[PDB]
Design an enzyme around this catalytic site. Structure first.
Site, mmCIF file in Angstrom:
data_model
loop_
_atom_site.group_PDB
_atom_site.id
_atom_site.type_symbol
_atom_site.label_atom_id
_atom_site.label_comp_id
_atom_site.label_asym_id
_atom_site.label_seq_id
_atom_site.Cartn_x
_atom_site.Cartn_y
_atom_site.Cartn_z
ATOM 1 N N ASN A 1 1.842 7.549 2.896
ATOM 2 C CA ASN A 1 2.645 6.593 3.656
ATOM 3 C C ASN A 1 4.123 6.968 3.762
ATOM 4 O O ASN A 1 4.853 6.407 4.578
ATOM 5 C CB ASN A 1 2.554 5.215 3.010
ATOM 6 C CG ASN A 1 1.310 4.482 3.400
ATOM 7 O OD1 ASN A 1 0.622 4.872 4.343
ATOM 8 N ND2 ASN A 1 1.006 3.413 2.687
ATOM 9 N N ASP B 1 0.829 -1.194 0.000
ATOM 10 C CA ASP B 1 0.000 0.000 0.000
ATOM 11 C C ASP B 1 0.876 1.261 0.000
ATOM 12 O O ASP B 1 0.618 2.220 0.715
ATOM 13 C CB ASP B 1 -0.942 -0.033 1.215
ATOM 14 C CG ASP B 1 -2.080 0.986 1.116
ATOM 15 O OD1 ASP B 1 -2.419 1.421 -0.008
ATOM 16 O OD2 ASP B 1 -2.636 1.355 2.172
ATOM 17 N N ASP C 1 3.452 2.524 8.051
ATOM 18 C CA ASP C 1 2.171 1.857 7.818
ATOM 19 C C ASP C 1 2.353 0.431 7.303
ATOM 20 O O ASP C 1 2.244 0.170 6.104
ATOM 21 C CB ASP C 1 1.331 2.674 6.827
ATOM 22 C CG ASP C 1 -0.093 2.162 6.698
ATOM 23 O OD1 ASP C 1 -0.896 2.385 7.639
ATOM 24 O OD2 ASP C 1 -0.407 1.544 5.653
ATOM 25 N N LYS D 1 2.434 4.747 -1.012
ATOM 26 C CA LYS D 1 1.797 5.978 -1.496
ATOM 27 C C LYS D 1 2.292 7.194 -0.702
ATOM 28 O O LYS D 1 2.805 7.047 0.407
ATOM 29 C CB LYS D 1 0.276 5.870 -1.364
ATOM 30 C CG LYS D 1 -0.178 5.621 0.048
ATOM 31 C CD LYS D 1 -1.670 5.572 0.130
ATOM 32 C CE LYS D 1 -2.095 4.915 1.421
ATOM 33 N NZ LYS D 1 -3.525 5.153 1.723
ATOM 34 N N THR E 1 -4.673 1.169 -1.948
ATOM 35 C CA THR E 1 -5.373 2.419 -2.225
ATOM 36 C C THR E 1 -5.572 2.508 -3.731
ATOM 37 O O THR E 1 -4.661 2.197 -4.499
ATOM 38 C CB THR E 1 -4.557 3.641 -1.754
ATOM 39 O OG1 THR E 1 -4.341 3.551 -0.343
ATOM 40 C CG2 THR E 1 -5.289 4.936 -2.070
#
Ligand SMILES: O=c1[nH]ccc2cc(-c3ccccc3CO)ccc12
Length: 279
Positions: free
Chosen positions: A138, A133, A151, A135, A165
């Site tokens: 993060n 995930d 995260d 991004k 996401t």
């Protein structure tokens, strides 16, 4: 180790962020004056929601990370109702915050911060871990403006449970519930595009529309896009995950770090270097 800590050891303040099963709160340890970002999770909500496997895996992955480009877990403790994780406080917040305020990065900053992310992923994948995930939300910036990636609840430790996401989801996810190191490289190709264009590559009115463009590979480069960046992005946003620059079938991170966009990069001591000023 020092004795286990307690909530009463801290002056809690400001909420740094809210997840779905956690809140992160800025705390100052009384005895030391140190500031931690403390991720607080309520057991009932976790147990009710069947997240024990995720909380556990999060703590476990974070205990194994020993690298400057990653949030460090300093300690954990527990009262009757709550779990606490003492994490690195990233003073300067989300990378996305800077994308927003300067609109997009010039070539030097794209290259510097892209390189740090590549170097972070090389380490992570080195230990057989998928973030799943990745991004700009993060990727945090410590007060020196180096990245710290956070995260790991949704992370997966190599030896398909439907995470991600929407903007950054890879095709193979939409197609086999599959994920691999290359899913992260997909996310990378998206984040790079977003550093330069100032906006995620696949965008639509809703998730389903987004997923459509993704599996179709439906996105375009703005004319001002740095050519060597554009080229690299095109070797990451490849529907076939076994042909993404940086993955094992492509022979790994050597060819990826070798890519011309990174010509001026010294990979060896990236976190010793002084980050270019944004914008
Ligand atoms: O400073 C931090 N250290 C470690 C983790 C962390 C996590 C967050 C967070 C938490 C929940 C949602 C979104 C976000 C993103 O803002 C903020 C700051 C930190």
């Amino acid at each position: 180790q020092p004795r286990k800590k307690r909530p009463e050891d801290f002056k809690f303040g400001k909420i740094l962020g809210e997840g779905s099963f956690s809140t992160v709160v800025l705390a100052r340890e009384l005895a030391t004056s140190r500031e931690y970002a403390i991720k607080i999770l309520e057991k009932r909500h976790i147990i009710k929601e069947n997240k024990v496997p995720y909380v556990t895996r999060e703590r476990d992955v974070m205990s194994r990370l020993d690298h400057p480009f990653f949030v460090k877990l300093y300690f954990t403790f527990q009262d009757d109702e709550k779990l606490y994780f003492g994490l690195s406080y990233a003073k300067n917040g989300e990378l996305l915050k800077y994308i927003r305020k300067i609109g997009s990065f010039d070539e030097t900053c794209t290259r510097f911060y892209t390189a740090e992310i590549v170097s972070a992923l090389e380490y992570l994948h080195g230990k057989g871990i998928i973030h799943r995930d990745l991004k700009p939300e993060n990727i945090l910036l410590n007060e020196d403006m180096h990245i710290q990636i956070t995260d790991f609840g949704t992370a997966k430790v190599l030896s398909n449970s439907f995470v991600g996401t929407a903007q950054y989801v890879s095709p193979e996810l939409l197609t086999e519930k599959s994920a691999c190191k290359s899913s992260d490289l997909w996310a990378l190709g998206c984040i790079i595009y977003q550093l330069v264009a100032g906006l995620p590559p696949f965008r639509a009115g809703n998730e389903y529309l987004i997923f459509q463009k993704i599996i179709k590979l439906e996105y375009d480069f703005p004319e001002k896009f740095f050519p060597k960046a554009r080229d690299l992005v095109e070797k990451l946003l490849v529907l076939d995950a076994t042909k993404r620059l940086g993955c094992e079938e492509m022979e790994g991170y050597g060819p990826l770090k070798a890519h011309p966009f990174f010509e001026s990069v010294t990979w060896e001591n990236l976190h010793q270097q002084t980050p270019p000023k944004l914008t």
